[PDB]
Protein backbone atom coordinates (compact mmCIF):
# COMPACT_ATOMS: atom_id res chain seq x y z
CA UNK A 1 0.00 0.00 0.00
CA UNK A 2 1.25 3.47 -0.97
CA UNK A 3 -0.46 6.55 0.47
CA UNK A 4 -0.03 10.25 -0.08
CA UNK A 5 1.70 11.87 2.88
CA UNK A 6 1.81 15.56 1.99
CA UNK A 7 0.20 18.35 4.03
CA UNK A 8 -2.53 20.59 2.63
CA UNK A 9 -2.33 21.46 -1.05
CA UNK A 10 1.47 21.28 -1.19
CA UNK A 11 3.16 19.21 -3.98
CA UNK A 12 2.20 15.55 -3.60
CA UNK A 13 4.52 13.14 -1.78
CA UNK A 14 3.97 9.44 -1.23
CA UNK A 15 4.83 6.93 1.48
CA UNK A 16 5.08 3.15 1.14
CA UNK A 17 3.34 1.65 4.18
CA UNK A 18 4.45 -1.20 6.41
CA UNK A 19 3.72 -4.68 5.06
CA UNK A 20 0.13 -5.60 5.86
CA UNK A 21 -1.07 -2.00 6.31
CA UNK A 22 -4.12 -1.55 4.07
CA UNK A 23 -5.35 1.92 4.96
CA UNK A 24 -4.44 5.55 4.25
CA UNK A 25 -5.85 8.52 6.13
CA UNK A 26 -6.68 12.20 5.73
CA UNK A 27 -6.91 14.11 9.03
CA UNK A 28 -8.08 17.72 9.33
CA UNK A 29 -8.29 20.26 12.11
CA UNK A 30 -7.79 23.95 12.66
CA UNK A 31 -5.52 25.75 15.06
CA UNK A 32 -4.83 29.46 15.53
CA UNK A 33 -2.68 29.56 12.37
CA UNK A 34 -5.09 27.96 9.94
CA UNK A 35 -6.55 24.74 8.58
CA UNK A 36 -4.30 21.70 8.64
CA UNK A 37 -4.76 18.64 6.43
CA UNK A 38 -2.41 15.74 7.17
CA UNK A 39 -2.12 12.49 5.23
CA UNK A 40 -0.41 9.18 5.83
CA UNK A 41 -0.47 5.41 6.18
CA UNK A 42 -2.87 3.66 8.50
CA UNK A 43 -6.11 4.75 10.12
CA UNK A 44 -5.21 6.35 13.48
CA UNK A 45 -7.56 6.59 16.45
CA UNK A 46 -10.16 9.35 16.63
CA UNK A 47 -9.13 12.17 18.98
CA UNK A 48 -11.76 14.74 20.08
CA UNK A 49 -12.40 17.51 17.55
CA UNK A 50 -10.30 16.04 14.78
CA UNK A 51 -11.91 15.10 11.45
CA UNK A 52 -10.65 11.74 10.18
CA UNK A 53 -11.22 10.04 6.84
CA UNK A 54 -9.79 6.57 6.15
CA UNK A 55 -9.73 4.59 2.89
CA UNK A 56 -8.23 1.30 1.70
CA UNK A 57 -6.93 1.66 -1.85
CA UNK A 58 -3.77 2.96 -3.51
CA UNK A 59 -3.10 6.68 -2.96
CA UNK A 60 -6.76 7.09 -1.99
CA UNK A 61 -6.21 9.89 0.53
CA UNK A 62 -5.59 12.98 -1.62
From Swiss-Prot:
GO CC terms in record: extracellular region
Reported impact of residue 5 to V: 1.4-fold decrease in potency of inhibition of Torpedo marmorata acetylcholine receptor
Annotated protein name in UniProt: Erabutoxin a
General function of this protein: Binds with high affinity to muscular nicotinic acetylcholine receptors (nAChRs) (tested on Torpedo marmorata, Kd=21 uM) and with low affinity to neuronal alpha-7/CHRNA7 nAChRs (tested on chimeric alpha-7/CHRNA7, Kd=0.07 nM) and inhibits acetylcholine from binding to the receptor, thereby impairing neuromuscular transmission. Blocks the extracellular increase of dopamine evoked by nicotine at 4.2 uM concentrations. In vivo, produces peripheral paralysis.
Disulfide bridge positions per record: 3-24, 17-41, 43-54, 55-60
Consequence the record notes for mutating residue 10 to A: 210-fold decrease in potency of inhibition of Torpedo marmorata acetylcholine receptor
UniProt-annotated stretches for the region Loop III: 43-54
Phenotypic consequence of residue 12 to A: 1.2-fold decrease in potency of inhibition of Torpedo marmorata acetylcholine receptor
Species assigned in the record: Laticauda semifasciata (Black-banded sea krait)
A single GO molecular function term of this UniProt record: acetylcholine receptor inhibitor activity
Keywords: Acetylcholine receptor inhibiting toxin, Disulfide bond, Ion channel impairing toxin, Neurotoxin, Postsynaptic neurotoxin, Secreted, Signal, Toxin
Keyword ATP-binding recorded: no
Record-marked site positions (Key residue for binding to acetylcholine receptor): 8, 10, 27, 33
Region (Loop II): 24-41
Residues the UniProt record annotates as site (Moderately important residue for binding to acetylcholine receptor): 6, 9, 25, 32, 34
Amino acid sequence: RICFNHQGSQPQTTKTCSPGESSCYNKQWSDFRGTIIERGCGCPTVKPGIKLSCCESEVCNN
